């Protein structure tokens, strides 16, 4: 989508494998501002907005 109409996907009621997302080398920027990248597979959240 465009940036003025960014698509929001609600991630809920599922188990999320962030290790596959973090170990991918295609991403040129992986910057977190409230959590740690190595603790995403350990913590639990109510829902994720993508």
């Amino acid at each position: 989508a465009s940036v003025y109409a960014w698509n929001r996907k609600r991630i809920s009621n599922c188990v999320a494998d962030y290790s596959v997302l973090y170990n991918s080398a295609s991403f040129s920027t992986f910057k977190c501002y409230g959590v740690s990248p190595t603790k995403l597979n350990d913590l639990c959240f109510t829902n994720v907005y993508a």
Binding site: Y22, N23, A25, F30, P37
Partner: protein, 50 residues
């Protein structure tokens, strides 16, 4: 900008009490090994306060 004061942004484990780490070895922040060379998910542990 006074950049002479630095803190350890990245480390593998928490320190002991009264433990000092001055080792300027590279950190592996991803699955790919760094081999002492900066790159993708390879960051210097010591970053300066701005």
């Amino acid at each position: 900008g006074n950049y002479n004061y630095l803190y350890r942004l990245f480390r593998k484990s928490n320190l002991k009490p009264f433990e000092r780490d001055i080792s300027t070895e590279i950190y592996q922040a991803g699955s790919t090994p760094c081999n002492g060379v900066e790159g993708f998910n390879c960051y210097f542990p010591l970053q300066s306060y701005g």
